[PDB]
Design a protein around this ligand. Structure first.
Ligand code: PLM
Lengths: 429, 429
């Protein structure tokens, strides 16, 4: 029994950590800074992510560690289990320090700089139209089902299709809320709450639908290329330039590039070029474009690109549970989440996910890719939160080697959905 | 010359980063959070640390990249070059988020957990008395030189001996200021300015005397030791446990252990056991004791200890320049620092460092260690700034394999000096 590992820690060591956390909670002593925040969040995320990953049905279909972690943390906040000091520490970690934007910037730059430049240019000609086709199909089916259920098309486009089809909470929920407030000038709280609820429902349906799509792909040998996206000789003409040995300095350079690209995007979106026309472009979209331009330019060495990828891997696979504890504490309210679990809303989300899958599959077939793997890669992983949950959709499916495609889908889809969301916000209100 | 590397980045890449920083500064747009803080501080630390390393005489003797960096950052703050937004972002990173405490916690846990358990338990029987002998010799020499210069014994002990023989800025300067305020009930800042100035002067003199000690060791062979500390058959019989494979999960476990140990120390020092006797113990000394006890207990696996060491290496070798930029911006004030350089202070610091060297050498010879190696490891690398002066001294000498001894000396001696400072503060007032 003692050989069981919790977050890579032997059971006695995690017992020591939990004793420390309980002592701090009961003595009401905690440094309201990043150290106290990490001390609480690492332990809580470890235990609850392990529980969520072990529980069978939750792990298989619901979403597992991140969903369980943030739901339980938000329930802890609601029930008053958390002390005001711990709540303040977590809110200082992810509000004053903005560790959320740090994490999102690291993930964006890792996902974009990871790919080889020639492969990126080869993809962007045919892969991007598949993303656009998935978006338009999801929008069409969302409008149809909204008309069926009587929800107005304006409300559908504002609340249902865009938050679902865009990125996760860190990118694609709070940026859309900010753009909504900046353009339409209504309160952010209710928009954010409903968007988060329907986004979580869409994540649930995305995992389940990827599972059933893997089943149907097993059933039908044709229209499914196991573990391969392209249908043209599986990209027979493919060469890798080179990659060397990666040291700690390369990872640090990746972090520096993360932060510098985010700063440049912030400056450009805030003061340099706030608006191309009547549309306002968000600094996350500018960051995606800037990192893509940096990758295409060739300034980055292969070692630097590998270091950025490895830093992104470290963040995504270690600090994700910490991020989820903080998200559960700061950006979730159980009462309104539950009040947004109506049968109408859940069926709307299911139909939108069907639309995204169908559009992505038909676009991939039209542009030369395998339709099922296209449907998981784009459409799915875009309806899914992205980052956390892109791994879950790939894990539910038998296909995991497409993780680079999944991350690039999440990031570029985020940029595009923010651009289109700004356009539609201006067009309607 | 475009292949020349600045902080591991080629010249065009750093040109892009510096263009980003200049655009941010001139447009006065910057996110006042950890992302903006790192965006400023990586760039500034990189350029100015490279300048400091390339500067020949400064690099070799006066100080390294850390010294050059925080001096330049302090000058930038003094001359008004830094924008108010940039100052706010850096102070948010260093004070509101309290990145300094996280850095110190990671350093302490790496330096103590990284040591093999059996080797640590065998070494402490003869290495701690060397540290104590060095401290007592430094105190005696400081008292003598203060009597020569007319400085009172209590003033000498409070302002020159303890701040020099303690750790660096993070541990041994601000903890000493806090203890001074809590015990004697006097102003923190007036103590801290003189403490940091004397600490910097002592660091310079310690590096110079380390070079002199290397020369004298080359001269006389029977004191040298040729880079080996122990003088008992050169470790004829020794066994080490295999470490296995190191992963990102072990690195994250090291981070968890660092943060949890810091939290436990904070709780113990604030609520559980604020005072073991009449003396009050600081939470940094408590953390040193807790991490030593955790190492002795054997709960941590060798993989986990290697991961803690790897985090210590990553932080110490990459985020040190960022931390130095933050220290220069926030905790450094050139006006009173320069006012604190004088003939009397310089002579007192030099005599204190010489006394520490003599005491450590005598203790090492009595306990069996090589005299020159013992005087470098304890006394030196303890009078320094705990995190950077040890690297600078070991680089000034030809010995670098004693980095583990230097690290454990810095951290454990910092804890011991904190306890001793509390005792003497209570004694005098
Ligand atoms: C807000 C605080 C940010 C702290 C960022 C810490 C980043 C640590 C990066 C470590 C990963 C790279 C080195 C791994 C080494 C190994 O796995 O052996």
């Amino acid at each position: 029994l003692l050989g069981f590992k919790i977050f890579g820690m032997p059971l006695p060591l995690y017992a020591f950590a939990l004793i420390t956390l309980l002592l701090s909670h009961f003595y009401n002593a905690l440094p309201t800074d990043i150290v106290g925040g990490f001390a609480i969040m690492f332990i809580i995320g470890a235990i609850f992510g392990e529980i969520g990953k072990r529980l069978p049905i939750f792990n298989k279909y619901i979403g597992g560690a991140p969903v369980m972690i943030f739901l339980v943390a938000a329930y802890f906040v609601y029930a008053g289990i958390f002390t005001q000091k711990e709540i303040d520490a977590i809110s200082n970690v992810m509000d004053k320090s903005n560790f959320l934007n740090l994490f999102i910037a690291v993930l964006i730059t890792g996902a974009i700089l990871s790919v080889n430049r020639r492969l990126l240019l080869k993809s962007l000609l045919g892969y991007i139209p598949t993303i656009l086709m998935g978006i338009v199909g999801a929008s069409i089916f969302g409008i149809a089902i909204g008309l069926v259920f009587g929800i107005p098309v304006d409300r559908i486009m504002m609340l249902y299709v865009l938050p679902i089809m865009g990125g996760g909470n860190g990118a694609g929920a709070v940026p859309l809320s900010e753009i909504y407030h900046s353009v339409t000038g209504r309160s952010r709280e209710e928009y954010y709450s409903t968007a988060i609820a329907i986004l979580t429902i869409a994540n649930i349906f995305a995992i389940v639908f990827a599972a059933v799509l893997d089943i149907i792909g097993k059933k039908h040998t044709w229209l499914s290329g196991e573990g391969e996206l392209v249908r043209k000789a599986s990209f027979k003409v493919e060469e890798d330039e080179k990659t060397g040995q990666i040291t700690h300095r390369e990872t640090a350079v990746g972090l520096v590039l993360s932060t510098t690209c985010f700063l440049l995007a912030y400056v450009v979106a805030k003061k340099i070029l706030p608006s191309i026309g009547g549309v306002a472009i968000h600094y996350f979209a500018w960051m995606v474009l800037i990192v893509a331009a940096l990758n295409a330019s060739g300034l980055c060495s292969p070692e630097i690109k590998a270091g950025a990828k490895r830093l992104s891997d470290f963040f995504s696979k270690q600090l994700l549970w910490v991020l989820m504890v903080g998200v559960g504490v700061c950006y979730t309210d159980l009462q309104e989440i539950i009040n947004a679990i109506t049968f109408a809303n859940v069926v709307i989300a299911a139909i939108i996910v069907i639309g995204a899958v169908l559009g992505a599959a038909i676009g991939g077939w039209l542009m030369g890719f395998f339709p099922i793997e296209s449907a998981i890669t784009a459409g799915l992983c875009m309806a899914n939160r992205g980052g956390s949950g892109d791994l879950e959709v790939l894990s539910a499916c038998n296909r995991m080697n497409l993780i680079s495609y999944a991350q690039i889908s999440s990031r570029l889809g985020g940029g595009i959905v923010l651009v289109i969301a700004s356009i539609v916000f201006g067009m309607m209100i």
